Amino acid sequence: MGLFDRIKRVVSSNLNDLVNKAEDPEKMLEQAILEMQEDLVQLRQGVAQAIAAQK
Amino acid sequence: MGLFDRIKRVVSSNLNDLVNKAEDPEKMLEQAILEMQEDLVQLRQGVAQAIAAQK
Amino acid sequence: MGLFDRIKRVVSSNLNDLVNKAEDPEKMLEQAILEMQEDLVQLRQGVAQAIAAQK
Amino acid sequence: AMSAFERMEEKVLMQESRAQALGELAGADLETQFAQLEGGSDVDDELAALKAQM
Amino acid sequence: TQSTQVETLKRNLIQLESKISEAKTKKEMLKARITTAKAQEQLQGMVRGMNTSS
Amino acid sequence: RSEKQYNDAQNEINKWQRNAQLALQKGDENLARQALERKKTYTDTSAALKASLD
Amino acid sequence: RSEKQYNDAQNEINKWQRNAQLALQKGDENLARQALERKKTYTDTSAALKASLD
């Protein structure tokens, strides 16, 4: 495998150290949350619809 | 290394003797302190915020 | 080798006598020290991190 | 979403422990515990003295 | 059975609402943590044994 | 002036231990204990400042 | 000044052996042993500095 899979791993290591290096804990924490409450809307809607059908 | 690293060290020695030579103990002591109490403000603010969240 | 390696050695001798000649013991001593305590910071940081992980 | 959440959990805990390492690294960790050991009964001793002062 | 199922659909919703609420509160605390970490790491290197600080 | 501030700190810790005994009589146990924790803190601070004063 | 720092180190190791005997009386065996390990370390350091002082 070596001649290709090690190329993969080393280029991937460069890119993923770049990515992790370009990460401020505070701002990216601040953006950690906004995303979490996205599938929470669909949950509300589906609960509502099951309710309405049963009603 | 010599031909470049010794150029570096000697030019750096000229510059850092210039810098250290242009340094009066009293005035630069006087300016030693003003700086120290700069991250002390952020400390206050962060303590306050952790307080408020926990409250 | 002569026709090139001796060119190398003689031009290198001119340059390295110039470099060593342009060297005052006192100022360049003064600049000898500032550099030594540079990898001492990283040492502190690494000790701290190993500590934290083990903790 | 929680992947970022928990990798960041580890992020912050690592930051706290790494910063706190500087303490025991420096030479004032055995002095603080000295003071705490020597004063642990002092607080109760002080309370007892105050009660006896009644 | 319609009612039986809507019941389990309502209880699950309550559970998940609770979970996300607790997640948010813990998140607030651990954002406070990093605020304090800013402070400490940026105000550290103050013992006489070291001068990592400028 | 360093000596003056040490003296003022001793006066203030005297005032605060007197406030602590005042709390011990009418005040709550929890507030009194906190007032005996501030007292010991300021007292150790006064001791350190006297060590410097030497 | 090199002599001054050696003298200060001897004074500080005196203080630390006195703290070690203090721990030996009230303090824990483990903390006392660590305090006898710091003492020997600083003492060998003082000996090396005196060797230089010569």
Author numbering:
A (entry chain A), B (entry chain A), C (entry chain A): 1 to 55
D (entry chain A): 164 to 217
E (entry chain A): 110 to 163
F (entry chain A), G (entry chain A): 56 to 109
Authors' description from the paper:
Alternatively, Vipp1Δα61–219 assembled with related but different lattices, termed Vipp1Δα6_L2 and Vipp1Δα6_L3. Specifically, Vipp1Δα61–219 purified in low-salt conditions (10 mM NaCl), has a greater propensity to form ordered helical filaments and quasi-helical ring stacks than does Vipp1. The structure of Vipp1Δα6_L2 was very similar to that of Vipp1Δα6_L3, although different helical parameters yielded a modified helical lattice with a slight lattice rotation relative to the helical axis. Specifically, the left-handed 21-start helix in Vipp1Δα6_L2 and Vipp1Δα6_L3 that runs nearly parallel to the helix axis formed a 19-start helix in Vipp1L1. The CTD modulates Vipp1 polymer stability and dynamism and in its absence, Vipp1 has a higher avidity to form polymers with increased regularity and stability.
